[PDB]
């Protein structure tokens, strides 16, 4: 008896652990986890964690070339 609305993104183990980091540096946003290719996130903060994903790979590479 469980069928609840959520945003399911096909993902990777690495970006899954990045989403858990998002939870670490600001908690209780992302809701539950199914596997490495299925996580469930707050549908209000999908774009918040999308732009946080953007600054995450910005911190990962940062590609200066100046």
């Amino acid at each position: 008896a469980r069928a609840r609305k959520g945003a399911l993104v096909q993902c990777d183990p690495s970006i899954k652990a990045l989403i858990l980091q998002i939870d670490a540096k600001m908690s209780d946003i992302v809701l539950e986890e199914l596997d490495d290719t299925h996580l469930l996130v707050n549908p209000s903060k999908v774009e918040f964690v999308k732009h946080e994903l953007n600054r995450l790979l910005s911190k990962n590479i940062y590609n200066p070339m100046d």
Binding site: A3, L8, H38
Partner: protein, 445 residues
């Protein structure tokens, strides 16, 4: 697919409107130029003997080597309502469209042309210094407007409405600016007559009465016209769209006379070289092409350095590459521009090594990239590192009873084009919100 898009629009146009379009010799000549060599051969074979032929005679004449293109020609010929295939006396009597037939006959014989070649005034002026230069000026202004650099001479208001309403150069008024869509980078990548066809296709798509056959016929005689002469100012709708395309820079009009520039011939047909760009593992640009337009279109995705008379130089940066990717420009669009701007030395060396490796093996234990990938695959691995994800947001179910029901519901969603994701191992799939109600109704039934 340009002639294919024209033929598709003509087949969307209903049969009697098409037959109205087949009335006049200039329109029939333009359609005679559109049709394939086989269909052209069929109509010129038929036009001088008025005998309805069975299809079996055509089958006897046709050698089966060109049978596929024969079927394409007769399928377009039938679907354009230009053929009359009826199985009278059991066998398929074939007939060309008679209005098309008589108008082609009058065009070939020089008979009744009704000035569909053009309502002439024949008060010719020089076209090299007036018509070509005015056309180059106005087309330069709209080209830099489509680049994005500021320029004083903006386009007209109706073509500004074309860019606003159409998905081509989305004038995002929330930002207040015209913006480059992916469709419009495709527009930029298009050929010159391809761009003209796209402009008229959008303009005819949104224009309504402005009679449709007036638009059709007037455009076909506009393509049929020649250069540098004065002509009579025709219908009213044709006259006001004539003044409209005068504001487009296409005709030099002295407010009844008008002087059609080189662009009418450009619409009729097309026309270490220019645009041959030396690729570099150093990612430095030695273009064999210089124009203010060239610098204007290359600045969108290249850090540039300086301009010389043929070699404008610069450097590809990954910031410029990501700038292009954030502009909505496809990596396929960027690399497609790179094959349009390939260079002869690297092309010769790639052909020699292509023959050398195909002498050895087709596989070669490496991915396939014929152009030198040290410029290309560094960008293309970063372009593989451009999107590399996929996101589903909305309704999602799980843990089905049987795999057959899973495949049935998922396959049904794929058939109606509302399936976004599936996974056979997890027996889960995602569908769009628009398709939710239809999938639920199918699930109940």
């Amino acid at each position: 697919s340009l002639k294919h898009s024209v033929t598709q629009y003509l087949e969307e146009i209903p049969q009697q409107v098409q037959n109205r379009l087949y009335t006049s010799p200039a329109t029939c000549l333009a359609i005679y130029r559109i049709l394939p060599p086989l269909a052209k051969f069929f109509i010129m074979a038929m036009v001088f003997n008025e005998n309805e032929v069975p299809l079996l005679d055509l089958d006897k004449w046709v050698n089966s080597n060109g049978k596929l293109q024969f079927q394409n020609a007769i399928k377009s010929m039938k679907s354009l309502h230009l053929l009359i295939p009826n199985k009278s006396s059991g066998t398929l009597m074939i007939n060309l469209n008679p209005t098309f037939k008589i108008s082609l006959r009058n065009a070939l014989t020089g008979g009744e042309v009704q000035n569909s070649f053009g309502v002439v005034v024949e008060e010719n002026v020089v076209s090299l210094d007036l018509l070509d230069e005015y056309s180059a000026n106005k087309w330069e202004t709209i080209l830099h407007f489509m680049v994005g650099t500021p320029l004083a001479k903006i386009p007209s208001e109706k073509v500004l409405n074309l860019l606003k309403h159409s998905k081509l150069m989305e004038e995002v008024n929330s930002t207040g600016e015209f913006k480059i869509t992916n469709e419009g980078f495709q527009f930029l990548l298009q050929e010159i007559n391809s761009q003209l066809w796209t402009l008229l296709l959008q303009y005819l798509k949104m224009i309504e009465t402005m009679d449709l056959v007036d638009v059709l016929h007037f455009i076909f005689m506009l393509g049929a016209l020649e250069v540098g002469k004065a002509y009579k100012i025709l219908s009213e709708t044709q006259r006001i769209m004539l003044q409209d395309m005068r504001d487009y820079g296409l005709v030099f009009q002295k407010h009844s006379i008008f002087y059609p520039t080189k662009l009418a011939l450009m619409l009729t047909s097309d026309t270490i070289p220019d645009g041959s760009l030396i690729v570099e593992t150093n990612f430095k640009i030695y273009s064999y092409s210089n124009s203010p337009l060239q610098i204007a279109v290359l600045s969108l995705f290249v850090h540039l350095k300086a301009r010389f008379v043929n070699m404008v130089l610069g450097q590809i940066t990954r910031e410029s590459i990501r700038r292009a990717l954030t502009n909505g420009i496809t990596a396929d669009q960027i690399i497609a521009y790179l094959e349009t701007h390939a260079h002869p030395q690297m092309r010769r060396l790639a052909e020699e090594k292509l023959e050398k490796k195909l002498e050895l093996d087709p596989n070669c234990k490496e991915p396939l990239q014929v152009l030198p990938p040290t410029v290309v695959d560094q960008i293309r691995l970063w372009q593989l590192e451009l999107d590399r994800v996929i996101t589903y947001e909305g309704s999602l179910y799980s843990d089905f009873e049987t795999s057959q029901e899973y495949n049935l519901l998922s396959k049904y969603a794929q058939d109606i084009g509302v399936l976004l994701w599936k996974d056979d191992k997890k027996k889960k799939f995602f569908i769009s919100k628009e398709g939710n109600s239809q999938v639920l109704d199918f699930a109940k039934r």
